[PDB]
Scaffold this active site. Structure first.
Site, PDB file in Angstrom:
ATOM      1  N   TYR A   1       1.070  -0.800   0.112  1.00 41.80           N
ATOM      2  CA  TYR A   1       0.082  -0.251  -0.069  1.00 41.80           C
ATOM      3  C   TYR A   1       1.136   1.262  -0.207  1.00 41.80           C
ATOM      4  CZ  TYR A   1      -3.324   3.522   1.493  1.00 41.80           C
ATOM      5  OH  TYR A   1      -3.915   4.723   1.836  1.00 41.80           O
TER       6      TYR A   1
ATOM      7  N   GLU B   1      -3.227   6.837  -4.165  1.00 42.30           N
ATOM      8  CA  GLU B   1      -3.568   5.932  -3.759  1.00 42.30           C
ATOM      9  C   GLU B   1      -3.285   4.865  -4.319  1.00 42.30           C
ATOM     10  OE1 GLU B   1      -7.441   4.500  -1.679  1.00 42.30           O
ATOM     11  OE2 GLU B   1      -6.504   4.715   0.622  1.00 42.30           O
TER      12      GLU B   1
END
Ligand SMILES: CCNC(=O)CCNC(=O)[C@H](O)C(C)(C)COP(=O)(O)OP(=O)(O)OC[C@H]1O[C@@H](n2cnc3c(N)ncnc32)[C@H](O)[C@@H]1OP(=O)(O)O
Ligand SMILES: [Mg+2]
Ligand SMILES: [Mg+2]
Lengths: 393, 309
Positions: free
Chosen positions: A116, A204
């Site tokens: 991530y 993101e």
């Protein structure tokens, strides 16, 4: 605003970020030609809608599944024929589904590592921050709850820019090794520069990962944009895909109105964001369900008042309307003018509760009186909320 | 340190104010209202319009010239979003002690860059942007708040919301407490003054006997304020603090009007803010309509409403 997968991936690719190779097609024949052009070992065909759940969705053609893998370009064209022009329904769409006008034809890549990585402006430290976790493929909230020790941050100085040591340390903490770590560090730099260039509030990437063949790739990503920078991001904002928005939110956007639909029946019409949030709050506290949030803005003009009121009265979910204005820069008379003219041009079929305070309140109240409209005047916020809740079944 | 400029928040009858964007629509109107209120508005700037008069006052091409020619100690900005960050930076470079930015819509990235310069100096204090300004009732008004609802008194108010400031003001005037100083820190995520900055001033101001703190979803300013109050508002001299945090009913992942009002990645919910403030001794009003009555009752229990006969 919202971008389709193909739009965000193109934006990333055009700025040096590694994504899967792909083309976009608006006909089945174009999908066929794109699949041949890819010269890929395996191909993925993906219908372009914003809602999630594409994989288990169903098209109005009868085809099951919005994401298909094949090695055969002709199969890409054939399946695209059963996607384009049809509606795709998923768990996250209404029953009718969403019309699919475009498909992505991409090289299908296997994932060997998932991490991530997000970039945003830190709300606690001035400046950009890299937020990363070696635990990829899940909502960041889950990692924060279960394994906060696996969340890493690098604070970036906006003037100095991102340093090689910051990118390298984050790549290491994400778990990349050797040459893949160097690749990931370089990609972090590309992502950072992209983030600033496009006035994103957040980039993101999840999963930010690697293929078995040894390449670091941004497999999927979500970009959120700063609405305040629209004036200097015209090309990006022109890509805004509004087809899946609440239609009332789309009408509100045409008039630069900050409207957010909620699940309720008491409409709210307010001149400040704080008071608008507080109005929703106090409606709830007194037993009601607000139908929407609306912040008219300090720079609101009469034409926007008129349009906002019409949107509320035209919404079938609305059973009453609460107007709550505490004007400073907003002159209450503009509110009274816009509302009375909007109702001169239609019948007022729901109760109307009005609380006015502040700038030019007496003139505004005389405008409301002399219009003859049926109004319940409120004495303060609590009284306004109670009267609004009392006005609905 | 930038904290050295906190003192400039406390405007008074001797503050002298210039208007950046003076010839614009809102600059003109609010400058007229400032003169009528009694604020010492002494001139303003619009680049390219220096050497004109406007409202009987001089217009200047630069903040530096305006400041040198009028002795101004504060500036208020009514400059449109594409240029307002440059206007703030010009006022910082000219070392104007207090700068108040009304503008809504400045790109967030612009304000991150402004804050970088702001934090590395101590001469200029910025309030805002996207804020209604600051008012010392009956002494100095810099901003867009309705003058007539205020009353000089005992409550210091700091708020991320202009409209909710007006609610707290009206409520505290109605119950007779009045306001010592009201500061709207604005609804943007990156700004010049936070809650803690104003709490420092309020806690050390003898005229401020109680505090209303108004917040909303987004960011961590309320939590930082709670930490400040844990360290600095405990003891026998602790002043009552009452608060309302807007947005308990807000959905996640959506900016609720204000650029800074969003629950993002699970961060910024109202519930955690209420909990943090309660743990710092703040009395949180259930309803936004009861800020005035809530702080009144806190004064009452502390025998702070006794009449001297
Ligand atoms: C409480 C939260 N805040 C709000 O709700 C405020 C919402 N409204 C806004 O933010 C609006 O953009 C503003 C009130 C700031 C400006 O709106 P307004 O209608 O007054 O804009 P205008 O275009 O009429 O006036 C802006 C003026 O600033 C001037 N200006 C531009 N750059 C600068 C600068 N760097 N320094 C000084 N003046 C400048 C413009 O030239 C213009 O004046 P002019 O028309 O005489 O040339
Ligand atoms: Mg506002
Ligand atoms: Mg998320």
């Amino acid at each position: 605003m919202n971008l389709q997968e193909y739009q965000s991936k193109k934006l990333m690719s055009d700025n040096g970020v590694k994504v899967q190779r792909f083309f976009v097609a608006d006909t089945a024949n174009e999908a066929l030609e794109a699949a041949k052009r890819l010269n890929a070992k395996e191909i993925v065909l993906k219908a372009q809608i914003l809602a999630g759940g594409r994989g288990k969705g169903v098209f109005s053609s009868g085809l099951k599944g919005g994401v298909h893998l094949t090695k055969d370009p002709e199969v890409v064209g054939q399946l695209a024929k059963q996607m384009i022009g049809y509606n795709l329904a998923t768990k996250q769409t209404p029953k009718e589904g969403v019309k699919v006008n475009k498909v992505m034809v991409a090289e299908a890549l296997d994932i060997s590592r998932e991490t991530y990585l997000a970039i945003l402006m830190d709300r606690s430290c001035n400046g950009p921050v890299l937020v990363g976790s070696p635990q990829g493929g899940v909502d960041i909230e889950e990692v924060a709850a279960s394994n906060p020790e696996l969340i890493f941050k690098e604070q970036i100085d906006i003037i100095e820019g991102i340093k090689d040591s910051q990118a390298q340390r984050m790549a290491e903490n994400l778990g990349f090794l050797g040459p893949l770590q160097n690749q990931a560090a370089d990609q972090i730099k590309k992502l950072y520069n992209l983030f600033l260039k496009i006035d994103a509030t957040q980039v993101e990437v999840n999963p930010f990962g690697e293929t078995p063949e040894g390449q670091v790739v941004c497999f999927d990503a979500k970009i959120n944009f700063d609405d305040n920078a629209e004036f200097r991001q015209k090309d990006i904002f022109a890509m805004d895909d509004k087809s899946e928005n609440e239609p009332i939110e789309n009408e509100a956007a045409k008039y630069d109105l900050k409207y957010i639909g909620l699940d309720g029946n008491i409409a709210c019409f307010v001149n400040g964001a704080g008071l608008a949030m507080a109005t929703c709050d106090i409606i709830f506290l007194n037993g009601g369900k607000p139908a929407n949030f609306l912040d008219l803005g300090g720079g609101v003009k009469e034409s926007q008042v008129y349009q906002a009121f019409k949107l509320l009265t035209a919404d079938p979910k609305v059973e009453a309307i609460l107007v709550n204005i505490f004007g400073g820069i907003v002159n209450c008379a503009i509110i009274a003018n816009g509302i009375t003219k909007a109702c001169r041009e239609l019948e007022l079929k729901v109760p109307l509760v009005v609380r006015l305070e502040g700038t030019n309140v007496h003139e505004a109240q005389n405008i409301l009186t002399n219009s003859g409209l049926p109004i319940t005047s409120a004495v303060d916020l609590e009284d306004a909320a109670k009267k609004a809740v009392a006005s609905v079944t | 340190s930038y904290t050295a400029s906190r003192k400039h928040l406390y405007v008074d009858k001797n503050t002298k104010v210039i208007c950046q964007g003076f010839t614009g629509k809102q600059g003109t109107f609010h400058s007229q209202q400032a003169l009528e209120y009694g604020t010492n508005l002494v001139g303003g700037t619009t680049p390219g319009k220096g050497g004109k008069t406007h409202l009987g006052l001089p217009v200047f091409n630069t903040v530096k010239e305006a400041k040198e020619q009028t002795g101004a100690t504060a500036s208020v900005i009514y400059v449109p979003p594409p240029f307002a960050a440059a206007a703030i930076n010009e006022a910082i470079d000219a070392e104007v002690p207090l700068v108040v930015c009304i503008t809504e819509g400045i790109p967030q990235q612009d304000m991150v860059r402004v804050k970088h310069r702001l934090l590395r100096q101590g001469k200029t204090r910025l309030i805002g942007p996207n804020c209604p300004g600051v008012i010392n009732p009956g002494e100095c008004k810099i901003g867009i708040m309705p003058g007539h609802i205020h009353k000089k008194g005992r409550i210091g108010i700091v708020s991320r919301s202009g409209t909710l400031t007006y609610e707290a003001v009206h409520q505290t005037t109605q119950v007779g407490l009045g306001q010592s100083l009201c500061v709207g820190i604005g609804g943007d995520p990156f700004n010049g003054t936070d809650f803690t900055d104003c709490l420092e001033i309020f806690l050390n101001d003898p005229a401020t006997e109680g505090i209303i703190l108004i917040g909303e979803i987004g960011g961590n300013a309320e939590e930082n304020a709670a930490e400040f109050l844990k360290q600095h508002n405990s003891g026998p001299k602790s002043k009552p603090v009452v608060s309302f945090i807007a947005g308990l009913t807000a959905p996640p992942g959506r900016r609720m009007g204000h650029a800074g009002a969003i629950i993002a990645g699970g961060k910024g919910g109202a519930k955690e803010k209420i909990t943090a403030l309660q743990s710092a001794g703040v009395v949180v009003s259930m309803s936004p309509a009861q800020l005035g009555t809530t702080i009144y009752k806190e004064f009452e229990k502390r025998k702070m409403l006794l009449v001297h006969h």
